mmCIF file of C-alpha atoms and ligand atoms in Angstrom:
data_model
loop_
_atom_site.group_PDB
_atom_site.id
_atom_site.type_symbol
_atom_site.label_atom_id
_atom_site.label_comp_id
_atom_site.label_asym_id
_atom_site.label_seq_id
_atom_site.Cartn_x
_atom_site.Cartn_y
_atom_site.Cartn_z
ATOM 1 C CA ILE A 1 -22.247 4.241 -27.570
ATOM 2 C CA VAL A 2 -25.507 4.506 -28.341
ATOM 3 C CA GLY A 3 -27.657 0.640 -27.790
ATOM 4 C CA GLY A 4 -24.232 -0.913 -26.607
ATOM 5 C CA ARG A 5 -23.479 -2.266 -23.753
ATOM 6 C CA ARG A 6 -21.254 -3.065 -20.675
ATOM 7 C CA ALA A 7 -17.807 -4.329 -22.085
ATOM 8 C CA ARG A 8 -15.890 -6.456 -19.685
ATOM 9 C CA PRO A 9 -14.087 -5.067 -16.979
ATOM 10 C CA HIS A 10 -10.033 -4.960 -19.020
ATOM 11 C CA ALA A 11 -11.726 -6.640 -22.099
ATOM 12 C CA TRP A 12 -9.566 -4.531 -23.991
ATOM 13 C CA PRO A 13 -6.601 -3.333 -22.711
ATOM 14 C CA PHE A 14 -5.051 -1.145 -25.366
ATOM 15 C CA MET A 15 -8.265 1.439 -24.923
ATOM 16 C CA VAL A 16 -7.013 4.629 -23.451
ATOM 17 C CA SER A 17 -9.383 7.957 -21.986
ATOM 18 C CA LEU A 18 -8.163 11.896 -23.216
ATOM 19 C CA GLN A 19 -8.663 13.718 -20.331
ATOM 20 C CA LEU A 20 -8.499 16.936 -19.315
ATOM 21 C CA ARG A 21 -9.200 18.461 -15.573
ATOM 22 C CA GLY A 22 -9.753 14.885 -14.837
ATOM 23 C CA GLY A 23 -12.474 14.615 -17.341
ATOM 24 C CA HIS A 24 -13.109 12.088 -20.305
ATOM 25 C CA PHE A 25 -12.906 13.978 -23.966
ATOM 26 C CA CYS A 26 -11.854 11.178 -26.421
ATOM 27 C CA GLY A 27 -10.698 7.739 -26.790
ATOM 28 C CA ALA A 28 -7.839 6.335 -28.026
ATOM 29 C CA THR A 29 -5.226 3.158 -29.138
ATOM 30 C CA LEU A 30 -2.342 2.062 -26.691
ATOM 31 C CA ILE A 31 0.038 1.403 -30.186
ATOM 32 C CA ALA A 32 3.155 1.019 -28.377
ATOM 33 C CA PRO A 33 4.036 1.035 -25.012
ATOM 34 C CA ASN A 34 5.396 4.961 -25.415
ATOM 35 C CA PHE A 35 2.219 5.760 -28.593
ATOM 36 C CA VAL A 36 -1.235 6.519 -28.643
ATOM 37 C CA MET A 37 -3.504 6.826 -31.245
ATOM 38 C CA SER A 38 -6.696 8.913 -32.097
ATOM 39 C CA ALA A 39 -8.925 11.351 -33.559
ATOM 40 C CA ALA A 40 -7.064 14.455 -35.199
ATOM 41 C CA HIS A 41 -10.189 15.887 -34.203
ATOM 42 C CA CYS A 42 -9.783 15.339 -30.628
ATOM 43 C CA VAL A 43 -6.758 17.656 -30.503
ATOM 44 C CA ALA A 44 -7.671 20.740 -32.927
ATOM 45 C CA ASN A 45 -8.502 23.443 -30.486
ATOM 46 C CA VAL A 46 -6.769 21.589 -27.280
ATOM 47 C CA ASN A 47 -3.954 22.793 -25.688
ATOM 48 C CA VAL A 48 -2.254 19.021 -25.939
ATOM 49 C CA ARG A 49 0.118 19.795 -22.020
ATOM 50 C CA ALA A 50 -2.944 20.011 -20.550
ATOM 51 C CA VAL A 51 -4.052 16.839 -21.847
ATOM 52 C CA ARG A 52 -3.493 13.848 -19.458
ATOM 53 C CA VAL A 53 -3.980 9.927 -21.580
ATOM 54 C CA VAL A 54 -4.870 7.641 -18.853
ATOM 55 C CA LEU A 55 -3.803 3.622 -19.891
ATOM 56 C CA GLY A 56 -5.643 0.603 -18.144
ATOM 57 C CA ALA A 57 -9.333 2.371 -17.486
ATOM 58 C CA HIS A 58 -12.962 1.058 -16.974
ATOM 59 C CA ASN A 59 -14.742 2.627 -14.824
ATOM 60 C CA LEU A 60 -14.300 6.404 -15.364
ATOM 61 C CA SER A 61 -16.281 7.169 -11.778
ATOM 62 C CA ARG A 62 -14.446 5.086 -9.573
ATOM 63 C CA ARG A 63 -10.590 4.988 -8.008
ATOM 64 C CA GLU A 64 -8.598 2.900 -10.398
ATOM 65 C CA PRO A 65 -5.139 1.450 -8.995
ATOM 66 C CA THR A 66 -4.876 0.020 -12.540
ATOM 67 C CA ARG A 67 -4.508 3.113 -14.044
ATOM 68 C CA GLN A 68 -1.882 5.066 -15.760
ATOM 69 C CA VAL A 69 -1.468 8.005 -16.487
ATOM 70 C CA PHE A 70 0.616 10.116 -18.685
ATOM 71 C CA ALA A 71 1.338 13.378 -20.295
ATOM 72 C CA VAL A 72 1.961 14.323 -23.940
ATOM 73 C CA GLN A 73 5.525 14.536 -24.649
ATOM 74 C CA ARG A 74 4.895 14.756 -28.805
ATOM 75 C CA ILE A 75 2.290 14.845 -31.848
ATOM 76 C CA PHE A 76 2.590 13.779 -34.768
ATOM 77 C CA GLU A 77 0.557 14.384 -37.324
ATOM 78 C CA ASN A 78 -0.962 13.246 -41.161
ATOM 79 C CA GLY A 79 -2.519 15.752 -43.644
ATOM 80 C CA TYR A 80 -6.108 16.227 -41.129
ATOM 81 C CA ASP A 81 -7.946 17.872 -43.529
ATOM 82 C CA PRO A 82 -11.078 19.243 -41.212
ATOM 83 C CA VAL A 83 -12.681 20.710 -44.885
ATOM 84 C CA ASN A 84 -12.922 17.422 -46.575
ATOM 85 C CA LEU A 85 -13.106 15.141 -43.097
ATOM 86 C CA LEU A 86 -9.836 13.681 -44.666
ATOM 87 C CA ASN A 87 -6.808 12.422 -42.607
ATOM 88 C CA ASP A 88 -8.506 11.777 -38.559
ATOM 89 C CA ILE A 89 -5.613 10.404 -37.380
ATOM 90 C CA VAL A 90 -3.122 11.841 -34.708
ATOM 91 C CA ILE A 91 -0.075 10.112 -33.179
ATOM 92 C CA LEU A 92 0.594 10.932 -29.539
ATOM 93 C CA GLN A 93 3.672 10.335 -28.105
ATOM 94 C CA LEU A 94 4.164 10.039 -24.428
ATOM 95 C CA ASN A 95 6.432 11.355 -21.793
ATOM 96 C CA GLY A 96 7.545 7.922 -20.529
ATOM 97 C CA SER A 97 6.380 4.423 -21.615
ATOM 98 C CA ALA A 98 3.424 2.505 -20.190
ATOM 99 C CA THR A 99 3.918 -0.951 -18.101
ATOM 100 C CA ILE A 100 2.614 -3.208 -20.337
ATOM 101 C CA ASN A 101 0.619 -6.509 -18.054
ATOM 102 C CA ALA A 102 -3.657 -6.942 -17.684
ATOM 103 C CA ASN A 103 -4.499 -4.371 -17.514
ATOM 104 C CA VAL A 104 -2.745 -1.715 -20.409
ATOM 105 C CA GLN A 105 -1.660 -3.830 -23.918
ATOM 106 C CA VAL A 106 -0.621 -2.966 -26.934
ATOM 107 C CA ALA A 107 -2.349 -3.094 -29.656
ATOM 108 C CA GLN A 108 -2.304 -4.871 -33.869
ATOM 109 C CA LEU A 109 -3.054 -2.871 -36.610
ATOM 110 C CA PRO A 110 -4.132 -4.576 -40.313
ATOM 111 C CA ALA A 111 -1.244 -4.803 -42.789
ATOM 112 C CA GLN A 112 -0.983 -1.018 -44.952
ATOM 113 C CA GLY A 113 -3.464 -0.734 -47.598
ATOM 114 C CA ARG A 114 -5.744 -3.803 -46.211
ATOM 115 C CA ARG A 115 -9.761 -3.236 -47.410
ATOM 116 C CA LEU A 116 -12.624 -3.949 -45.594
ATOM 117 C CA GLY A 117 -15.382 -5.884 -47.130
ATOM 118 C CA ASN A 118 -19.474 -4.207 -46.992
ATOM 119 C CA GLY A 119 -20.308 -7.506 -43.880
ATOM 120 C CA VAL A 120 -17.180 -6.813 -41.531
ATOM 121 C CA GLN A 121 -18.379 -7.462 -38.206
ATOM 122 C CA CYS A 122 -16.566 -5.285 -36.134
ATOM 123 C CA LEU A 123 -16.763 -4.354 -31.864
ATOM 124 C CA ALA A 124 -16.980 -0.416 -31.673
ATOM 125 C CA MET A 125 -16.099 1.309 -28.197
ATOM 126 C CA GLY A 126 -16.020 3.785 -26.226
ATOM 127 C CA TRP A 127 -17.388 6.322 -22.991
ATOM 128 C CA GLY A 128 -18.705 8.437 -25.265
ATOM 129 C CA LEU A 129 -22.711 9.589 -24.899
ATOM 130 C CA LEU A 130 -25.534 6.657 -24.485
ATOM 131 C CA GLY A 131 -28.171 8.529 -25.442
ATOM 132 C CA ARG A 132 -28.874 10.353 -28.924
ATOM 133 C CA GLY A 133 -24.356 11.739 -20.312
ATOM 134 C CA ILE A 134 -20.995 9.689 -20.993
ATOM 135 C CA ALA A 135 -20.783 6.642 -20.440
ATOM 136 C CA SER A 136 -18.782 5.716 -16.232
ATOM 137 C CA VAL A 137 -18.413 2.034 -17.765
ATOM 138 C CA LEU A 138 -16.658 1.306 -21.372
ATOM 139 C CA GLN A 139 -19.062 -0.091 -23.728
ATOM 140 C CA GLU A 140 -19.179 -2.260 -26.768
ATOM 141 C CA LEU A 141 -21.134 -2.202 -30.132
ATOM 142 C CA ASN A 142 -21.234 -4.909 -32.553
ATOM 143 C CA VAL A 143 -21.100 -2.904 -35.971
ATOM 144 C CA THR A 144 -21.267 -3.931 -39.453
ATOM 145 C CA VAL A 145 -19.023 -2.394 -42.023
ATOM 146 C CA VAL A 146 -20.597 -0.758 -44.848
ATOM 147 C CA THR A 147 -19.240 0.966 -48.035
ATOM 148 C CA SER A 148 -23.085 2.745 -48.748
ATOM 149 C CA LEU A 149 -23.313 6.564 -47.457
ATOM 150 C CA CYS A 150 -19.489 5.861 -46.885
ATOM 151 C CA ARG A 151 -16.463 7.299 -48.640
ATOM 152 C CA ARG A 152 -12.942 5.050 -49.670
ATOM 153 C CA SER A 153 -11.565 7.789 -47.604
ATOM 154 C CA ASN A 154 -13.529 6.061 -44.565
ATOM 155 C CA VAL A 155 -14.450 2.629 -43.276
ATOM 156 C CA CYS A 156 -18.385 3.631 -42.184
ATOM 157 C CA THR A 157 -20.161 1.235 -39.757
ATOM 158 C CA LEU A 158 -23.861 0.107 -39.504
ATOM 159 C CA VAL A 159 -26.565 -1.200 -37.038
ATOM 160 C CA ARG A 160 -29.055 -2.900 -38.153
ATOM 161 C CA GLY A 161 -32.113 -3.099 -37.653
ATOM 162 C CA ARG A 162 -32.181 -0.796 -34.722
ATOM 163 C CA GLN A 163 -30.982 2.244 -34.068
ATOM 164 C CA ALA A 164 -27.258 2.470 -32.393
ATOM 165 C CA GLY A 165 -24.228 3.975 -32.703
ATOM 166 C CA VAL A 166 -21.406 5.443 -31.710
ATOM 167 C CA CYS A 167 -21.675 9.600 -30.448
ATOM 168 C CA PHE A 168 -19.487 12.044 -28.733
ATOM 169 C CA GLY A 169 -17.343 11.409 -26.267
ATOM 170 C CA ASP A 170 -16.636 8.094 -28.901
ATOM 171 C CA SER A 171 -14.052 10.363 -30.784
ATOM 172 C CA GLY A 172 -10.377 9.049 -31.482
ATOM 173 C CA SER A 173 -11.673 5.507 -29.801
ATOM 174 C CA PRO A 174 -11.311 2.507 -32.116
ATOM 175 C CA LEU A 175 -12.876 0.124 -33.956
ATOM 176 C CA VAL A 176 -11.919 -3.484 -33.972
ATOM 177 C CA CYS A 177 -12.374 -5.861 -36.568
ATOM 178 C CA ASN A 178 -10.953 -9.259 -37.230
ATOM 179 C CA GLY A 179 -8.886 -8.644 -34.254
ATOM 180 C CA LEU A 180 -7.230 -5.822 -35.668
ATOM 181 C CA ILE A 181 -7.535 -1.747 -35.117
ATOM 182 C CA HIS A 182 -9.161 -0.864 -38.672
ATOM 183 C CA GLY A 183 -10.768 2.387 -37.301
ATOM 184 C CA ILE A 184 -10.278 5.609 -35.151
ATOM 185 C CA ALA A 185 -14.316 6.702 -34.345
ATOM 186 C CA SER A 186 -14.014 9.980 -36.923
ATOM 187 C CA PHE A 187 -17.839 11.400 -37.545
ATOM 188 C CA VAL A 188 -21.353 10.928 -37.378
ATOM 189 C CA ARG A 189 -23.771 12.575 -39.130
ATOM 190 C CA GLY A 190 -28.227 12.761 -39.212
ATOM 191 C CA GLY A 191 -26.834 12.257 -35.179
ATOM 192 C CA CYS A 192 -25.854 9.778 -33.255
ATOM 193 C CA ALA A 193 -27.337 6.800 -34.187
ATOM 194 C CA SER A 194 -29.832 7.587 -36.989
ATOM 195 C CA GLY A 195 -30.101 4.580 -37.972
ATOM 196 C CA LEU A 196 -29.392 6.522 -41.586
ATOM 197 C CA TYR A 197 -25.663 7.495 -42.044
ATOM 198 C CA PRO A 198 -23.100 5.299 -40.961
ATOM 199 C CA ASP A 199 -20.728 5.961 -38.281
ATOM 200 C CA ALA A 200 -17.261 6.934 -40.100
ATOM 201 C CA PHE A 201 -13.769 5.887 -38.820
ATOM 202 C CA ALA A 202 -10.535 6.992 -40.286
ATOM 203 C CA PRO A 203 -9.219 4.279 -42.142
ATOM 204 C CA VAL A 204 -6.435 3.301 -39.996
ATOM 205 C CA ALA A 205 -4.558 0.136 -42.850
ATOM 206 C CA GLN A 206 -4.327 3.146 -45.093
ATOM 207 C CA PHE A 207 -2.187 4.787 -42.136
ATOM 208 C CA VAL A 208 -0.090 1.369 -41.378
ATOM 209 C CA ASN A 209 3.389 2.448 -43.126
ATOM 210 C CA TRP A 210 2.985 6.361 -41.290
ATOM 211 C CA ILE A 211 2.182 4.809 -38.019
ATOM 212 C CA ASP A 212 5.376 2.403 -38.035
ATOM 213 C CA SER A 213 7.800 5.047 -39.092
ATOM 214 C CA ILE A 214 7.094 6.548 -35.817
ATOM 215 C CA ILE A 215 6.695 3.392 -33.312
ATOM 216 C CA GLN A 216 9.436 1.751 -34.618
HETATM 217 C C1 LIG B 1 -15.378 18.345 -34.319
HETATM 218 C C2 LIG B 1 -16.152 17.883 -33.771
HETATM 219 O O1 LIG B 1 -15.864 17.464 -32.445
HETATM 220 C C3 LIG B 1 -16.645 16.600 -34.090
HETATM 221 C C4 LIG B 1 -17.510 15.751 -34.307
HETATM 222 C C5 LIG B 1 -16.839 15.257 -32.306
HETATM 223 N N1 LIG B 1 -17.911 14.510 -34.493
HETATM 224 C C6 LIG B 1 -18.516 14.131 -33.648
HETATM 225 C C7 LIG B 1 -19.907 13.038 -33.228
HETATM 226 C C8 LIG B 1 -20.241 12.129 -32.215
HETATM 227 C C9 LIG B 1 -19.066 11.058 -32.657
HETATM 228 C C10 LIG B 1 -17.770 11.131 -33.593
HETATM 229 C C11 LIG B 1 -17.189 10.211 -33.120
HETATM 230 F F1 LIG B 1 -17.536 9.680 -34.633
HETATM 231 F F2 LIG B 1 -17.102 8.848 -32.519
HETATM 232 F F3 LIG B 1 -16.266 10.470 -33.186
HETATM 233 C C12 LIG B 1 -17.591 12.325 -33.814
HETATM 234 C C13 LIG B 1 -18.847 14.828 -35.261
HETATM 235 O O2 LIG B 1 -19.222 14.156 -36.358
HETATM 236 N N2 LIG B 1 -18.524 16.334 -36.158
HETATM 237 C C14 LIG B 1 -17.250 16.585 -36.062
HETATM 238 C C15 LIG B 1 -15.889 16.617 -37.057
HETATM 239 C C16 LIG B 1 -15.479 14.929 -36.277
HETATM 240 C C17 LIG B 1 -14.375 14.478 -37.141
HETATM 241 C C18 LIG B 1 -14.285 15.284 -38.632
HETATM 242 C C19 LIG B 1 -12.923 15.368 -39.540
HETATM 243 N N3 LIG B 1 -12.322 14.582 -40.261
HETATM 244 N N4 LIG B 1 -15.220 16.534 -39.268
HETATM 245 C C20 LIG B 1 -15.747 16.901 -38.069
HETATM 246 C C1 LIG B 2 4.696 11.916 -17.322
HETATM 247 O O1 LIG B 2 3.491 12.793 -16.744
HETATM 248 C C2 LIG B 2 2.463 12.379 -15.546
HETATM 249 C C3 LIG B 2 1.247 12.898 -15.485
HETATM 250 O O2 LIG B 2 2.195 15.165 -15.239
HETATM 251 C C4 LIG B 2 0.676 15.056 -14.661
HETATM 252 O O3 LIG B 2 -0.037 14.968 -15.787
HETATM 253 C C5 LIG B 2 0.730 16.568 -17.099
HETATM 254 C C6 LIG B 2 -0.956 16.654 -17.815
HETATM 255 C C7 LIG B 2 0.505 17.499 -16.738
HETATM 256 O O4 LIG B 2 -0.405 18.336 -16.249
HETATM 257 C C8 LIG B 2 1.627 17.308 -14.924
HETATM 258 O O5 LIG B 2 2.011 18.515 -14.333
HETATM 259 C C9 LIG B 2 1.065 16.528 -13.619
HETATM 260 O O6 LIG B 2 2.289 16.126 -13.355
HETATM 261 C C10 LIG B 2 3.759 12.491 -14.089
HETATM 262 O O7 LIG B 2 2.813 11.969 -13.344
HETATM 263 C C11 LIG B 2 4.647 11.220 -14.467
HETATM 264 O O8 LIG B 2 6.186 11.239 -13.357
HETATM 265 C C12 LIG B 2 5.458 11.607 -16.034
HETATM 266 N N1 LIG B 2 7.041 10.755 -16.772
HETATM 267 C C13 LIG B 2 7.441 10.938 -16.566
HETATM 268 C C14 LIG B 2 8.247 12.143 -16.714
HETATM 269 O O9 LIG B 2 8.979 10.101 -16.868
HETATM 270 C C1 LIG B 3 -21.046 -9.960 -32.038
HETATM 271 O O1 LIG B 3 -19.022 -9.151 -31.478
HETATM 272 C C2 LIG B 3 -18.358 -10.545 -31.020
HETATM 273 C C3 LIG B 3 -17.436 -9.708 -30.892
HETATM 274 O O2 LIG B 3 -16.634 -9.527 -32.425
HETATM 275 C C4 LIG B 3 -15.685 -10.216 -32.830
HETATM 276 O O3 LIG B 3 -13.778 -9.683 -31.554
HETATM 277 C C5 LIG B 3 -13.571 -8.640 -32.208
HETATM 278 C C6 LIG B 3 -12.672 -8.183 -30.959
HETATM 279 C C7 LIG B 3 -13.668 -7.875 -33.207
HETATM 280 O O4 LIG B 3 -12.319 -8.382 -33.589
HETATM 281 C C8 LIG B 3 -14.779 -8.907 -34.464
HETATM 282 O O5 LIG B 3 -14.388 -8.529 -35.689
HETATM 283 C C9 LIG B 3 -14.814 -9.628 -33.662
HETATM 284 O O6 LIG B 3 -16.445 -9.609 -35.300
HETATM 285 C C10 LIG B 3 -18.740 -11.543 -31.661
HETATM 286 O O7 LIG B 3 -17.794 -12.974 -30.857
HETATM 287 C C11 LIG B 3 -20.646 -11.956 -32.030
HETATM 288 O O8 LIG B 3 -20.135 -12.928 -32.980
HETATM 289 C C12 LIG B 3 -20.820 -10.486 -32.491
HETATM 290 N N1 LIG B 3 -22.424 -11.117 -32.978
HETATM 291 C C13 LIG B 3 -23.166 -10.450 -34.069
HETATM 292 C C14 LIG B 3 -24.233 -11.171 -34.615
HETATM 293 O O9 LIG B 3 -22.260 -10.129 -34.700
HETATM 294 C C1 LIG B 4 -13.621 -12.220 -29.043
HETATM 295 C C2 LIG B 4 -14.968 -12.728 -29.734
HETATM 296 O O1 LIG B 4 -16.009 -12.614 -28.375
HETATM 297 N N1 LIG B 4 -15.024 -13.749 -30.314
HETATM 298 C C3 LIG B 4 -16.361 -14.457 -31.132
HETATM 299 C C4 LIG B 4 -15.774 -16.050 -30.998
HETATM 300 O O2 LIG B 4 -14.806 -16.569 -30.575
HETATM 301 C C5 LIG B 4 -17.145 -16.864 -31.739
HETATM 302 O O3 LIG B 4 -16.700 -17.447 -32.417
HETATM 303 C C6 LIG B 4 -17.896 -16.190 -32.309
HETATM 304 C C7 LIG B 4 -19.834 -16.806 -32.041
HETATM 305 O O4 LIG B 4 -20.478 -16.590 -32.624
HETATM 306 O O5 LIG B 4 -18.481 -14.806 -31.900
HETATM 307 C C8 LIG B 4 -16.983 -13.616 -31.723
#
């Protein structure tokens, strides 16, 4: 996140760090004790057997006993199309179930098909780059839903009056709007925090029947 701020430790207990040999590479969201969801592009060229799913994290540079660590048992995809930047979503089934507590919680999702209007206020978040290295402390950022320079196949957001946005490493992280996970961070244009192109997220509301079919 560029131009954001530190989150309060464990403010967003559904927030997940996907890691390889102890290094964060993508965010994800806990959607049931045994399932996370992320961006399809996070795992496209990654061997998932090596992925560690880290729950209950805040500061990635510190040893944290609030953490729970899982491996990926199964992947569910939904037609990820990198040529057209579409369906940038994957569900990772864990090799066991999270222990739900103060530091690890299941996120609430929107109704199937729910659109967000121009001007909706959301929080983006993640451990991605802080300037246009990766964040130690989880960052969050106030963003505004926009339709200009967006397609109906994304939820896009823009910070006005300054350059701020998601960045590399924020891939797969949730966008929270009106208390529900409405987005998964998908792509930028014009580099991070251009102040021109809105950030694009996979529109989670469009995938809700699909999600529900998998997680129960
Ligand atoms: C392949 C890849 O690694 C890509 C990355 C990280 N990003 C990217 C860069 C910075 C931030 C983000 C974020 F939005 F956070 F997901 C994504 C692209 O903008 N472009 C790439 C990209 C990402 C997603 C999709 C889709 N659909 N197509 C291309
Ligand atoms: C589920 O997985 C946990 C973490 O597994 C570790 O990371 C993965 C990516 C592999 O490299 C693996 O060799 C590591 O052990 C385990 O600690 C935990 O026991 C597992 N839970 C089960 C099997 O119920
Ligand atoms: C900045 O955002 C703060 C938190 O956002 C609210 O709660 C999150 C989890 C989402 O549900 C989001 O849709 C909500 O807006 C707000 O408390 C604060 O008002 C925001 N400030 C401005 C100026 O946008
Ligand atoms: C989750 C959160 O922090 N939401 C706050 C809300 O409680 C408050 O009424 C408003 C004030 O502007 O900002 C937003």
